[PDB]
């Protein structure tokens, strides 16, 4: 009754079953602002029975408690106004069932739903690892007043816009919205309204809506970008940018301080992520929340206007694919004719066959990748001119919405050399993609390769979860409990180099960590930075300009604090811009941030210089 997974510790004292809680299937609802979620009326009237009882007893409609329970058992016409007056400013904790890190419990404000499904704002889904293929989430109600304030001030969904494992934003726009942006801010060499001049972004959207120009048609506009070059003062500079119609329409949504060159490019997924990141580093939190919502709304709207389907003709077969396969078949014929006459060894034969099928696979991938990335060739006022294609699967790949090089490779080019479960590769590849039909043997080899992957994930998840458990129980105690340990020791952060090109730069390792002694400028004996400064982005840029060798920085393992970690030897807060506060549990967020990517990890001569120096 004590030990085990089902004893008292792990089953009734660390985890408890909980009143004022609910559970249902999630769905999208994209009209939401990212601090609010949809919550059904039936669940809302069940979770908030005591607040409704208290409200009903305050008005004077009833007398005893029984009367109120009969009123909400009957659900009369007056308790729905009571319910909209108990919801209004009262957050709830939404929770997806495998919570791995702290962004899997977030607090929203309810918006009542005719329905029986929790409507969950889409950007927030990338935090929960929540798709909508049958998922379920639990709602919990903060009862007391300190818990409502903790849900609004610590656990609100507007407050979690950076992942605590690093500095990367976690409210990155996921899949439909990056397709809507990548189709919006792009260009083509001729459209309606090529090379006309526009007096502002407002009439750019007016020309798109009336039907006189196209969403991607290159155009000189006059935009007014606000650069804040003074000390907190926004200076207007207006100019004519040679841009498109879609870039001006998306400029109507960008806040004041960002420059126009954040939208002047094509805006895949990495570019929109660094757009939101530069907005958070410059303009702070509130413009970044409202701008994340306006990004999501305009992405959904112009992805709807795009009509970006997928067809059977979109997967363009290379015309050179069959001759490449016949040249590889002639090469394996030459190698086996040498094998009949015994000139070569068996291992060298197997190595030569795997090498020519790897080379033919790379050539087929380059043939289809040229045939997709520049297939469109349209003329403008004369001879032809080429451009990047508006093929649907190519925009779904190039935008980074869903797809890569490998998946679009397997839908058009040959799908490689699949490997048998012995671990060694199979010498006869799967020369047929998915647009052509796989025959029987090729699909069976494919099933070898995919059954191994499903078995690996379904057995990998146990070790990933047990690793997170061991990590949060070794951490478990360590709380930021001082402000300075008063030391001069700390580890020597250098960039890491394995022997190829320099892998992880110093700005990734010494971003937001407080230096141990003052870094000498690389010239001679200068106090470039002082000895207890947090290295945020401005300091790291003045480190990259001076090409600083390596920084002696303060590390947690050198902290002199008895029973805890001081506030300087930890570093930056990582989801807050400042230093770690006195109190915030860093052992648990660290253990979750190491063990949470446990699913994505796998389970089962001489020196040649490259550069010149």
């Amino acid at each position: 009754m004590i030990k085990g997974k089902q004893g008292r510790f792990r089953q009734n004292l660390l985890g408890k079953r909980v009143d004022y809680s609910g559970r249902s299937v999630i769905t999208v609802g994209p009209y939401l602002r990212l601090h609010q979620c949809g919550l059904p009326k039936k669940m809302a009237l069940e979770l908030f029975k005591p607040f409704i009882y208290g409200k009903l007893e305050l008005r004077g409609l009833a007398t005893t408690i029984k009367a109120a329970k009969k009123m909400v058992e009957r659900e009369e016409a007056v308790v729905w106004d009571i319910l909209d007056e108990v919801i209004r400013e009262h957050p709830v904790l939404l929770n997806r069932a495998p919570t791995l890190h702290r962004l899997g419990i977030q607090a929203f404000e309810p918006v009542l739903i005719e329905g029986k499904a929790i409507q969950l704002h889409p950007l927030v889904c990338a935090a929960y690892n929540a798709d909508f293929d049958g998922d379920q989430m639990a709602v919990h109600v903060p009862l007391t007043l300190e818990a409502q304030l903790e849900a609004r001030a610590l656990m609100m969904s507007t407050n979690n816009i950076l992942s605590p494992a690093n500095g990367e934003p976690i409210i990155v726009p996921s899949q439909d919205v990056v397709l809507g942006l990548y189709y919006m801010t792009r260009d083509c060499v001729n459209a309606k309204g090529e090379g006309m001049v526009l007096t502002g972004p407002k009439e750019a959207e007016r020309l798109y809506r009336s039907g006189l120009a196209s969403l991607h048609a290159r155009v000189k506009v006059r935009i007014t970008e606000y650069e804040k070059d003074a000390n907190g003062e926004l200076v207007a500079k207006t100019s004519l940018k040679d841009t498109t119609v879609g870039r001006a329409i998306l400029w109507m949504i960008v806040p004041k301080g960002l420059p126009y060159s954040i939208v002047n490019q094509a805006l895949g997924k990495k570019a929109i992520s660094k757009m939101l990141n530069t907005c958070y580093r410059i303009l702070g939190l509130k413009p970044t929340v409202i701008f994340a919502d306006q990004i999501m709304y305009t992405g959904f709207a112009y992805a709807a206007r795009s009509g970006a389907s997928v067809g059977i003709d979109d997967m363009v077969i290379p015309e050179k694919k069959h001759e490449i396969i016949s040249e590889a078949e002639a090469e394996v014929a030459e190698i086996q004719e040498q094998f009949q006459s015994g000139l070569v060894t068996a291992g060298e034969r197997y190595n030569k066959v795997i090498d020519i099928w790897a080379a033919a696979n790379d050539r087929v991938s380059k043939a289809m990748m040229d045939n997709l990335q520049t297939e469109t060739v349209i003329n403008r006022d004369g001879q032809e001119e080429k451009q990047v294609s508006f093929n649907s699967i190519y925009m779904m790949a190039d935008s980074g919405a869903r797809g890569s090089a490998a998946q679009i490779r397997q839908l058009a080019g040959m799908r490689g050399l699949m490997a048998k479960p012995d671990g060694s590769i199979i010498e006869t590849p799967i020369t047929a993609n998915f647009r052509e039909g796989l025959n029987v043997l090729q699909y069976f080899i494919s099933t070898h390769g995919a059954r191994k992957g499903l078995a690996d994930t379904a057995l990998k998840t146990a070790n990933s979860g047990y690793l997170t458990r061991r990590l949060v129980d070794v951490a478990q105690d360590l709380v930021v409990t001082e402000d300075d340990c008063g030391t001069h020791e700390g580890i020597m952060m250098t960039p890491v180099i394995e022997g190829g090109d320099v892998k992880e730069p110093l700005r990734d390792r010494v971003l937001g960590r407080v230096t141990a002694e003052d870094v000498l400028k690389p010239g001679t004996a200068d106090i470039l930075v002082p000895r207890n400064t947090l290295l945020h982005e401005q300091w790291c840029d003045l480190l990259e300009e001076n090409s600083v060798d390596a920084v002696k920085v303060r590390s947690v393992v050198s902290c002199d604090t008895d029973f805890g970690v001081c506030a300087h030897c930890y570093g930056r807060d990582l989801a807050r811009g400042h230093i770690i506060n006195k109190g915030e549990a860093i052992g648990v967020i660290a253990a979750q941030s190491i063990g949470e990517p446990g699913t994505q990890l796998t389970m089962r001569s001489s020196i040649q210089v490259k550069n010149k120096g």
Binding site: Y20, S21, L47
Partner: protein, 1322 residues
């Protein structure tokens, strides 16, 4: 030619390869196994006769009486299957066994017995199988799932790397019997051979040789060859066959015949062996340093002194040679211990052995097996002679002896079930050979090494357990038997056999509850091959390789239909064409290929036969003769897919469906999907609910017909003919004369099972699909079951789907649905709930069934009778009352009255009551008694009259050869008819013959109706104990709503997000809205591109349907329709279908075109499907654009979507994960007993488990107060939660926390040890 429901709607069948072997009956594993179990099969194998011929005749220990066997039988079941499911009894049969007791006198092995007695005794009841492969165990309908276990017979396993931490391989060898003790041999890293029995302690293995009465010299004769040292002129020369020097270093001077052959230093090559064989070199003189390391073979004794020189297996030194040379033993036999090949493993094991003779070997084996209790001669000898060598407790079966002789390369395959000396010695020899290098190991995933148990084998093993318990009981009663005052039921007892066989059929890991929501799901739960179960591996332990697909699965096990999660690849599903071998292995069909011409004869192979041959591929182009049109063809030799010549192959695959199963060969365009999404597609396709209106997949594979027939959910006609079609109650089929028996005039009356409960609360319902007066053939379907449409298989429905992002409402995998889907009720499924109410006599008198419900006012007496129990059918919801069932003394009276659960609605469709003999309220119980009483007689006479009408006419019909006088035959009406004498003329006995029929009809009807009333007149039929037994069947009708789950056949899951109006849908320029919008972004990542080809080909199918709907609505004479139908059925490449359409009588064209105006159904088979050019060509026959993509406008803005989008028809299914079975919320209610925390679940009104990682997530924030109320006030602390509820309803959000109760439970459980845990200072 076609049958008559085949000419209704003949599906356009793509497919180029002519099929040679039609699909076998898909439930043949279950049916053939259980038909093997119960069948009167003389020669004894296999069945119940094997059990009775093993256990009988029982003779006691010289008790001079020997009960023997004659014959067995199974009587009728007392309950047919329907009333058996209704009542709750097992569907069983009584097992009537004839037993013949003969009793001897003194001294009669040969003497005649003094007395006999014989009777048809009754032992157990065995559960029979329903005709569809199911059991009915206790009211519920269960399925035994066929196991996949290791075969009996020897296995040579390696375990090459992990032990010893030194890279040294071991080699063990397991002799797995079908029944009995396990014997394993195994090396250890000191290169010594060890035996262990039943995974016990480790004995050095040659002791088992010393247990088989082998001396040391005989063992060394077996496992070693002799090298002969002859004492000669000098230095004791050597016989040397040159094979023994292979690969070793020449230590000495190799010379003979006055010639130096090989000098010292160089290794001996095979050319030197050829020199020694050409030069005929045997005898060479050795140095004394050569014999100074070798080991003697046999014993030698000094002759004159009379003592021992050396024991066998002793290494030799020079002074030992001085001992044995001077005595007079001229021959010296040494053991050739080659370090390369012939290792000295047995000899070093003999050096490890602490034993010397046979008796100490048996004493050491007995001290291993049974410790503590002493080892005496009789006890140890009986132990070891009944370990392996008696027919009782050790039995390799026929499978085991076949594998045992096959793995040892024996010639024969049939032998005795026990082992012998030579078998154990051969296993040790093959293990030593594998260590030496020759021969190799076996793998365990190889399906030639992996047998299937099925229903008959498992029930036979449990029945044999019951029979050995009843023979120990018969041996008990007989030695205490007094004669002649007992007859054979004081000896025998029906209890242990029935107990064991109901233990297996009720509570086993394989007799499990049938997934019954779908015809597919029934027919693919019956074809399931589980690795789990008794004697097999477990879910949470193993492994990686047994979860993985091995190259012997090609055509035996489906590669892609295995459930994802904790058991992947343990719950494999059987392929389409794969039968089961005689021994239980998996044999699959192949086409025998003698020479260039591929012959149409089939021939079945298993994996231990598939390796030797060379087997072709299913789709390799052969034209008009069977000759492979290429000179090279892809085949597979020994699990290796490789390219071979035109004329080397011996077999070809039969058909191209044969790799996959019946779940994942219903997916069209399987070959274009990814493997992962085909797995998710098949596993979700098992989960579909039956819709209210079944709708014919436009893009099918043609295997829908075989699944919908072979799963017994449709009423397939037994005998062909016409129809009478009363049908409100039953289809009545008049039988054509050729299929009709001479006696038993006979017309077939099919029972339609109307609205009733499935095992997954779905609705199984049959509807007649034939009209009145319409010809049907044998094997044709008559009534469409759940999820069937004219004999095809209609799980979901086909809807117009656009691929586009639509305003974010289909973001990750969500699905946006029009209102035209929910207005038409085209997913509005029907669920049925059984609810029981009993009024058991717990304590303080019995409970009561009265409407006079207390405290509660005229809100109890409402949906009931004037004085008790829900009336019949209204629209009951949640909080209603169905069965008033409350006691007095339980003011102090209470409300246990079974009500309707919270959140559900419905209509009471049926009320069953076999209650405590007394339920009658006023006088209803006997009121209905008279109703049924008069009902029976009516139909009884009616049926007789029905036949009488047919017979009367038949009398006159035959009245021609013996009185055709039409005006002299219409005498008496209901009195007599025939008043003449035919006598002979040309034999019309026929009048007299029919006279007996009517005479017997009335005579039997009376008796038939006599028992009817007898059966009618009764309290009711059920078991005892339970008193008030009221079951009420609600039927909720759930429509579709934001939150349900839909999915196609390709793995495209979706939670339907927004239920749009019709106006806001994307309409094309023709005006029709699209029904369902999916999302294109799923398609490049999830590489299931087959849903797009299904979309385009379904678009083309409905294009033909719209074209026929125009040609038939704007009505044309049938020449233009038959021309367009002929063009639609020719269409393209060389196919199998074409049609013979000009023989459809100018009406069967029109009925076909009436059944095609919703869309022309297209069969795209599994791997030989429709190519893309045929999709484009079919889209050109309909007037649709060739790209598959139409420009679509927006319903909101009226303006065109740029870049035209894909619209087509995908067959989308509604899975039974409905959102108002998942929605749940809890504020406050009941909790558990032991702990003070809330209960768990939905059926218990309970709250969410705020688990461990959520606590770590709140610790990760600064949520200290949220966590404090999350584990103290909201959950556990009783004073805290009552103060909090009062604080909330006063308007004061403040918690008074206290200490959790489960921590004080922890303190008392820790303190209830010898542990003093406390709580210190303030």
């Amino acid at each position: 030619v076609y049958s008559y429901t085949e000419k209704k709607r003949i599906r356009k069948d793509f497919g180029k390869r002519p099929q040679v072997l039609d699909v076998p009956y898909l439930l043949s594993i279950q049916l053939d196994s259980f038909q093997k179990f119960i069948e009167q099969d003389p020669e004894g194998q296999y069945g119940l006769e094997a059990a009775f011929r093993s256990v009988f005749p029982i003779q006691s220990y010289s008790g001079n009486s020997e009960l023997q066997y004659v014959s067995y039988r199974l009587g009728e079941p007392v309950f047919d299957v329907q009333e058996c499911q209704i009542r709750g009894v097992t569907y069983s049969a009584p097992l009537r066994v004839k037993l013949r007791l003969v009793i001897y006198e003194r001294e009669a092995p040969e003497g005649t017995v003094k007395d006999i007695k014989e009777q048809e005794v009754y032992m157990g009841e065995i559960p029979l199988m329903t005709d569809n492969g199911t059991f009915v165990i206790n009211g519920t309908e269960r399925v035994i799932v066929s196991q996949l276990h290791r075969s009996p017979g020897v296995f040579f396993d390696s375990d090459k790397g992990k032990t010893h931490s030194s890279g040294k391989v071991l080699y063990n060898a397991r002799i797995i019997p079908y029944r009995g003790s396990w014997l394993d041999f195994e090396f250890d890293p000191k290169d010594n051979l060890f035996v262990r029995i039943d995974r016990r302690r480790k004995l050095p293995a040659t002791i088992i040789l010393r247990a088989l009465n082998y001396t040391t010299e005989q063992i060394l004769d077996l496992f070693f060859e002799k090298v002969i040292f002859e004492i000669r002129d000098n230095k004791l020369q050597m016989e040397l066959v040159p094979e023994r020097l292979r690969g070793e270093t020449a230590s000495f001077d190799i010379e003979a015949n006055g010639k130096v052959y090989v000098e010292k230093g160089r290794r001996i090559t095979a050319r030197h062996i050829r020199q020694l064989e050409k030069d005929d070199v045997k005898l060479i003189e050795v140095p004394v340093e050569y014999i100074a390391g070798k080991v003697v073979a046999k014993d030698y004794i000094d002759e004159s002194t009379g003592e021992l020189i050396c024991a066998a297996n002793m290494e030799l030194s020079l002074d030992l040679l001085a001992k044995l040379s001077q005595s007079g033993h001229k021959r010296i036999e040494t053991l050739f211990t080659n370090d390369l090949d012939h290792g000295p493993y047995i000899s070093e094991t003999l050096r490890v052995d602490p034993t010397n003779d046979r008796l100490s070997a048996l004493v050491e084996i007995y001290r291993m097996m049974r410790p503590g209790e002493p080892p005496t001669r009789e006890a140890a000898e009986s132990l070891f002679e009944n370990l392996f060598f008696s027919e009782d407790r050790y039995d390799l079966s026929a499978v085991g002896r076949m594998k045992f002789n096959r793995s040892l390369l024996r010639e024969e395959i049939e032998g005795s079930g026990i082992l012998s000396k030579d078998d154990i010695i051969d296993v040790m020899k093959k293990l030593i050979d594998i260590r030496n290098g020759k021969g190799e190991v076996d793998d365990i995933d190889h399906l030639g090494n992996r047998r299937i148990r099925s229903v008959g084998e498992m029930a036979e093993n449990q029945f044999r357990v019951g029979l050995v318990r009843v023979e120990r009981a018969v041996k008990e009663r007989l030695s205490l038997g007094d004669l002649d005052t007992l007859m054979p039921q004081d000896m025998i007892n029906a209890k242990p056999i029935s107990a064991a066989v109901k233990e297996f059929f009720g509570s086993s890991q394989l007799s499990q509850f049938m997934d019954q929501n779908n015809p597919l799901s029934e027919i693919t739960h019956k074809r399931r091959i589980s690795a789990l179960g008794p004697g097999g591996l477990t879910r949470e332990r193993a492994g990686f390789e047994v979860r993985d697909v091995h190259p012997t699965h090609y055509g035996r096990v489906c590669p892609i239909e295995t459930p994802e999660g904790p058991n992947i690849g343990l719950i494999n599903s059987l392929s389409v064409y794969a039968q089961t071998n005689e021994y239980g292995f998996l044999e699959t069909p192949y086409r025998k290929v003698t020479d260039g011409v591929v012959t149409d004869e089939i021939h079945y192979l298993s994996a231990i036969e598939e390796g030797n041959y060379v087997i072709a591929q299913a789709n390799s182009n052969l034209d008009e003769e069977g000759h492979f049109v290429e000179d090279l063809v892809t085949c597979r030799s020994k699990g290796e897919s490789s390219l071979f010549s035109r004329d080397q192959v011996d077999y070809m695959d039969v058909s191209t469906q044969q790799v996959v199963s019946v779940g994942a060969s219903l997916i069209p365009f399987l070959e274009h999907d990814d493997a992962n999404r085909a797995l998710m597609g098949a596993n979700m396709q098992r989960q579909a609910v039956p819709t209210l209106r079944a709708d014919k997949p436009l893009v099918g594979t043609g295997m829908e017909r075989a699944v919908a027939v072979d799963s017994g959910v449709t009423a397939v006609a037994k005998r062909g003919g016409v129809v009478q079609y009363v049908d409100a109650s039953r289809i009545v089929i008049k039988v054509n004369e050729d299929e009709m028996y001479p006696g038993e005039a006979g017309i077939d009356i099919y029972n339609l099972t109307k609205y009733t409960r499935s095992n997954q609360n779905t609705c199984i319902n049959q509807m007649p699909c034939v009209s009145l007066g319409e010809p049907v053939e044998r094997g044709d379907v008559l009534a469409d079951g759940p999820s069937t449409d004219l004999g095809e298989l209609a799980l979901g429905q086909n809807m117009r789907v656009a691929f586009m992002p639509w305003n974010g409402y289909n973001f990750e995998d969500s699905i946006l649905v029009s209102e035209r889907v929910v207005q038409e009720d085209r997913f509005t499924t029907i669920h049925i709930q059984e609810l029981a109410c009993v009024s058991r006599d717990t304590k303080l008198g019995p409970e009561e069934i009265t409407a006079d419900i207390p405290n509660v006012g005229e809100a109890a007496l409402s949906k009931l009778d004037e004085s008790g129990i829900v009336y019949i059918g209204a629209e009951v919801t949640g909080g209603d009352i169905l069965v008033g069932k409350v006691t007095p003394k339980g003011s102090d009276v209470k409300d246990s009255s079974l009500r309707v659960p919270n959140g559900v609605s419905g209509t009471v469709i049926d009320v069953q009551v076999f209650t405590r003999d007394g339920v009658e309220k006023d006088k209803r119980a006997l009121e209905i008694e008279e109703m049924q009483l008069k009902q029976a007689k009516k139909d009884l006479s009616e049926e007789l009259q029905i036949l009488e009408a047919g017979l009367f006419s038949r009398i006159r019909a035959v009245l021609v050869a013996g009185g055709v006088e039409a005006e002299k035959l219409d005498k008496l009406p209901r009195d007599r008819w025939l008043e003449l004498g035919l006598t002979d003329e040309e034999k019309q006995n026929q009048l007299e013959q029919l006279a007996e029929q009517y005479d017997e009809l009335k005579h039997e009807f009376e008796k038939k109706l006599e028992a009817k009333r007898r059966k009618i007149t009764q309290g009711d039929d059920l078991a005892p104990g339970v008193l008030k037994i009221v079951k009420v069947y609600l039927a909720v009708k759930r429509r579709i709503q934001p939150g349900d789950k839909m999915a196609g056949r390709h793995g495209n899951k979706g939670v339907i997000s927004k239920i749009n109006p019709i106006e806001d849908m994307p309409y094309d320029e023709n005006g029709t809205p699209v029904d369902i919008v999916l999302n294109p972004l799923g398609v490049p990542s999830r590489m299931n591109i087959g849903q797009i080809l299904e979309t385009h080909l379904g678009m083309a199918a409905k294009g033909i349907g719209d074209k026929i709907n125009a040609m038939l609505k704007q009505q044309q004479e049938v020449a233009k329709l038959r021309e367009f139908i002929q063009r639609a059925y020719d269409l393209g490449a060389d196919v199998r279908q074409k049609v013979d359409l000009s023989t459809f009588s100018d009406e069967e064209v029109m009925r076909l075109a009436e059944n095609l105006r919703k869309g022309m159904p297209i069969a795209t088979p599994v791997f030989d499907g429709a190519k893309e050019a045929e999709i484009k060509e079919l889209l050109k026959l309909g007037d649709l654009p060739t790209s598959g993509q139409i420009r679509l406008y927006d319903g909101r803005t009226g303006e065109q979507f740029e870049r035209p989008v894909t619209v087509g028809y995908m067959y989308m299914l509604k899975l039974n994960h409905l959102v108002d079975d998942k929605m749940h919320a809890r504020s406050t209610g009941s909790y558990s007993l032991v702990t003070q925390q809330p209960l768990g679940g939905k059926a218990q009104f309970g709250g969410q488990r705020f688990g461990e990682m959520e606590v770590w997530a709140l610790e990760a924030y600064g949520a200290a107060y949220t966590l404090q109320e999350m584990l103290t006030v909201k959950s556990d602390d009783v004073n805290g939660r009552t103060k909090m509820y009062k604080n909330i309803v006063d308007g004061n959000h403040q918690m008074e926390p206290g200490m959790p109760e489960s921590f004080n439970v922890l303190l008392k459980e820790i303190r209830s040890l010898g542990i003093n845990i406390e709580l210190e200072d303030e």
